[PDB]
Design a protein around this nucleic acid. Sequence first.
RNA 1: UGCUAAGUGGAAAAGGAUGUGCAGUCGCGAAGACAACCAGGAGGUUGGCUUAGAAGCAGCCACCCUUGAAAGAGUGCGUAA
Lengths: 133, 37, 126, 387, 375
Amino acid sequence: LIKLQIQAGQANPAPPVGPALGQHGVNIMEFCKAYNAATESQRGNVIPVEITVYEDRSFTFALKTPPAAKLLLKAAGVQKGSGEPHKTKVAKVTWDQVREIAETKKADLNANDIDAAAKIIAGTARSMGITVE
Amino acid sequence: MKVNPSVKPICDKCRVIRRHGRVMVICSDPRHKQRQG
Amino acid sequence: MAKADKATAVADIAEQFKASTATVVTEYRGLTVANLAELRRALGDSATYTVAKNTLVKRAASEAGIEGLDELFAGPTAIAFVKGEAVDAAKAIKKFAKDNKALVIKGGYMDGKALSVADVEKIADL
Amino acid sequence: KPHVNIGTIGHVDHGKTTLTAAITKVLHDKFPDLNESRAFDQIDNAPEERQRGITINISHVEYQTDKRHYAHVDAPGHADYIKNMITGAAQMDGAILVVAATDGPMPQTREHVLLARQVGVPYILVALNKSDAVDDEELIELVEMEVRELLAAQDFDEEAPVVRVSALKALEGDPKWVKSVEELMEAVDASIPDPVRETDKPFLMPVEDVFTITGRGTVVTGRVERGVINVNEEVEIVGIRPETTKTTVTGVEMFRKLLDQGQAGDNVGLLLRGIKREDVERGQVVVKPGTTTPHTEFEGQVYILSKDEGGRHTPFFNNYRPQFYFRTTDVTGVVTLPEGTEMVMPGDNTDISVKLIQPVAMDEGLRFAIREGGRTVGAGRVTKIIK
Amino acid sequence: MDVLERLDLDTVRDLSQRTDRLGVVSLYFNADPTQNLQVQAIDLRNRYRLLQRRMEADGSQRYRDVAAALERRRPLIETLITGVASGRGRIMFIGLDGDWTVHFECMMPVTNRVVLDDGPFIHPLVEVLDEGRPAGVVVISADDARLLEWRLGQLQEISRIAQPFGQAPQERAGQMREQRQAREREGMQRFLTQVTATATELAEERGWERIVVSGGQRWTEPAKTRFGPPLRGKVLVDRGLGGLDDAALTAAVSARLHRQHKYDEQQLLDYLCDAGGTGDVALGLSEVTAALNAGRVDHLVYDPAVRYVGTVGADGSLYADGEIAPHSHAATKDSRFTERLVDRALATGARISPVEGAADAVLKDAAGVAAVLRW
RNA sequence: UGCUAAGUGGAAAAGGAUGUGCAGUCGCGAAGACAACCAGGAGGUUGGCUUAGAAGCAGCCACCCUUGAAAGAGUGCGUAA
Ligand SMILES: Nc1nc2c(ncn2[C@@H]2O[C@H](COP(=O)(O)OP(=O)(O)O)[C@@H](O)[C@H]2O)c(=O)[nH]1
C-alpha cells in the first residue's frame, strides 16, 4: 500500500515517483498514464493518491483531496510558509476563505458541521504562521 | 560486558539487580550488560 | 480523571437516561475507531452512542428507574440512547452487528421495563 | 543408457511436487534395486542456489527407468522456473505440463508454454492431475481440448502423449493409479526423443589464445564444444573480423602430444597452415565449413538481474548500450525494446532486439550474458537471427 | 576585483552560482617556470583567438555582440600573464557584462584552458583542490621545535618553541655524565609530550589531514607514537627534514604528501573494484548519471583525463549518450559533461574524488566513472 | 534493649547502587489504585522551515482543531525517506 502526493498531471517523471512505485514491482508507465487521465482538469492543484498493490503485481488506486496546507498557501499568494511561526507571519486569510477550503475538504474531514470544520483548517494555518481574520 | 565503578541503565529496558554481592545491569540489548568492579 | 471529574461524568450519564426514550446496551471490544465512525454516522439521525465505566454507570443508573439493569454492566459496555422512535436505530445496529460480528447486544429498556436481546431484534422487524 | 534431462512445469498449486513424488515412489517400487524414492519434503524444500549471483530455488531428483537415465527438476515458485529456464546452466530436452483438471490452464501455464517455446526446449507433453477429484468426462474433455489448442498454437507437438492421472491417490498407495504413473514412465520413454550427441554435431571451437612457438607456428587453442576434428580437414575461421578465412589443419596438439583427431571437451591445440597470429584472435570460431555464419543483428529473450543479486538499480530504455558476451568475448550492442514497452526494471524478463557493431557467430538457442561496467547485469538466449 | 584566498569547496560552489547575461569566460594559465613561459602564453592567446573565430563564425546578433565583448576584453589576457603573485597556476573568471574578474593563484600546476559558458568552469579547480589538501609539519630537535602548515604547495610557518626543560647543571652538585643524560632524557620526553599536544590542538583547529613528523635518528618514532588514536594513523615519518632550507623542505613535504595521496587513491580504486558485484557501487556513465539524478551518490569517482560526453534533459537531468527517458524529450547534447556531473554531485552534497588514472587499469570497463550508492 | 552479615569490626576519594533499621511530609485508591492479561491507540497531515531525502522520531519554529473512551504536532526501536 503506497501513499504519496503527485502533481496534478505530471506523474510521468520517474525519480520522485518511479523508485517509490517500483519497490513493489508496479510498472510505472502504466500507472502514470491512468493517473494522468483521471486527474487532468485539476491542473495547478497538487493531489495525493492511495495506491493499493495486489499479490500479483496488479494495482488499484483511490484519489484524494489537495492538502489543507497547500490550499492555504495559494489562498494567500505566498510561495512558502514561515520558518518561525508565532513570530513572523507571512500573510493573512479572511475567515471566509477558511470556510471555502474546509468545504472542498468536507469529504475527508471529521467534522459533521461547517463550524467545527473551519476550526480544523484554522489550526493548520497556525502551523505555518498565517493569520486568520 | 562493561566493568566500571559506575553502572547505570543506558536504555529504558535495563534493570539494575544485585547478584552475589555485585551491582549489575541486565537488558535485552547485549551492549548494555555491565557489572560493577 | 480524579474524584472531581468522576462527579462531573456521573452527572452526564444521569440525564442521558431521563432525556432518552429508550436505551440499548452493547459491547465493542475489537472495533477500530474507523469502524465506530460507521456506526455513529449510520445512527446519527436517530440515536447517540457512548461508552462509560461499568461501575460508574451503576452509580448514575441509581438516579433513574432502571434498577433492573445492573447485571448487564459487566465486561466492555457501550450503551446507545435513542432520542427518536425505536425501529430506526434498532435496524441500523442489527444490520451493523450482523456484518462485523464483533458487536454484541446485551439487552435493552423500553416501556419502563428491562428487555432481552431476542425482544430487541423483533423491534426492528415491527 | 543415455541420460536425459526433463522437468516439471505448470501453474503453481497443481501438484508438480506431488507428481514428482508419485514418479519417484513408482520408479522405486518397480525397481527397488535401481531407483530410490525421494521424500515429499525434499521436493517441497528446495535448497537455494546463487550461481553467477542469480538466486534460484530448485529441487533435483534422478531416477533410471528401463530405457535411459532421467533427470528431474522441480522448483517452488514461478520466478524460479523463469530464471532457471532463461539463464539455463543445464537445459531440459522435454518437459511435462502438470495441468490439474480442476481449473485447466491459468496465465502461468501460458507463460511457461511461451518460455518453453522461447529458450528452445523441443518436446512437451501433458499430464492432467487430480483426475480422481474430477468425475465429469466433459471437464477432462474440455481441458484436453484447451491444452491441445494451447500447445498447437505455440508450434509445439500437436500430438503430445496426453495422459490422465491422479498424483495424490497414486502417491498415497492406491493401485488404481500406479498404473497411470508407470504409463507416464513408458510414455516418456517412448516420447522425449533422444538428444543428438555432442560429438555427432559438426565441429565448432571458440578461439581462446594464439600462442606462437618455434618450429611449429601459431597454435590456436580452445576447448572443442561440439564435434570432432581430423587432420587435413578443411575448416573456416569465422568471427569478429569482417572477412571469413578458409584454411586446413596440419596437426592437432594435446598436452604437447600430437594426434590425428580431437573430439569434444578436449583442450586441443589446432595448428593451421598459412595462418599467422594477425589472422586469428580470441572470439573467432573455427567451424566445419558452411555450418555456421556470422551475424550482427538478432532478437533474444533476457532476464535482467536485480539490485540484490548485483545487477543494476535503475531501468534502461531504448538505445541502452551494454556489452554482450558470447562464447569467449563481448561486443557492444544497441538495444531496442518491443513496442508497448519503453523501460525495463531490474528483475524482469523481456524480449529485446540487439544490433551489434562487430559480426559474430550465433544460432538459435545460444546463451549470452549482458555485462556492464565489468559485471553481469543479465542473461538470456538467442531466439531469432534477423540478419 | 576579487583576488580570492583560502579556496575550499564552499567557495567554489558559491562561485559556480555566479551568472551573466551574455556569458562567462574561464581562463586557466600554466605558469610553471620549468616549461617555457612564452610557449604557454602563446598557446593561451591562440586558444583565445580561436574562441573569437568560433564565435564570429555564427554571425547572429547575439553571437555578434558577444564576439564584440570578446574583443573588448583582450588586454585582460596580459593581466593573467603578469600575475599578482608568483603562483605556478593561475585562474581568472571574467564576466562579459560586468567588470567582475575573479582572480586566483596557487602553486599546484594547471593546464592551459579557455572556456566560455553561462558560468564559471570550476571542474579543473576542483581537481586542484583535490591534489592540495592541507597538512601539518613538525620538525623537532634537541634544541627547539618548529611547526609549519603545507597547503596547495605553499609552506606557511606557524610557530617555534624552545626547550623549556633544559638547563646546564654546571657541575655544581656532583655531576656525572649519567645524571646529565638522565635529566636530559626526562626533559626531552616532557618536551615531546608538550609539542605533540600543541600539534594535536593545531590539527583539530585548522583541519589538518596528515602530519609529517621529523625528529631525527633518535627522536622520530617516540614523537609519532605520542599522537593519539584519532591521529596516529595519519602521521608520516621522515628523519631528515632538519637542516633543510625552505625550498628543499617544501619539495620533500610535497613529494611525501603526493605519494600518500596516490596511495589513498589506489586504495579507493581497489575498494570500488571489490564492492562491485554486490550491487553497492554504480559503475559506468549511464548508471552513475541515473544515481546522480536520484541523488543516491555518496561518493563520485571519475577520471579527469577522460573526455566525457552526454545529454542534458529539459528538466536539468543527465543521461548517457542515446538513452533518454520516455517521458522526457528535447534532450540537448552536452559535450563537456564532466562539469555537469560535478555540478550535480555538488548540488546533492556528495564527495568528489577525481582519480588521476582510473580508466586505464581498474575501472576500464566502466570508462573510469563510478559512484557509491547511498542505498 | 536494639543494630550489623560485611570477619564490617581489624585502612582510603570523587562517585555508583531495589542492602537493611527508625522517624517525618505528600500523591493515588473499593468511584477498583500499582503489576499483569484482552481491545482501541484516529482524521486534517507527509504541521511550517531546512535538506539530496526529513513523512511523530538529524536539526530549527510553533504544538492547534476535530470524532471521541482516549489517542502526544508524539516515549522508544527501526528505514536512505
Ligand atoms: N485432489 C487432488 N489434489 C492434489 C493431487 N495432487 C496434489 N494435490 C494437492 O494439490 C497441492 C499441489 O501443490 P504443488 O503444486 O505440488 O506444490 P508445488 O509443486 O511445490 O507448487 C498439494 O498440496 C496436494 O495436496 C491430486 O491428484 N488430486
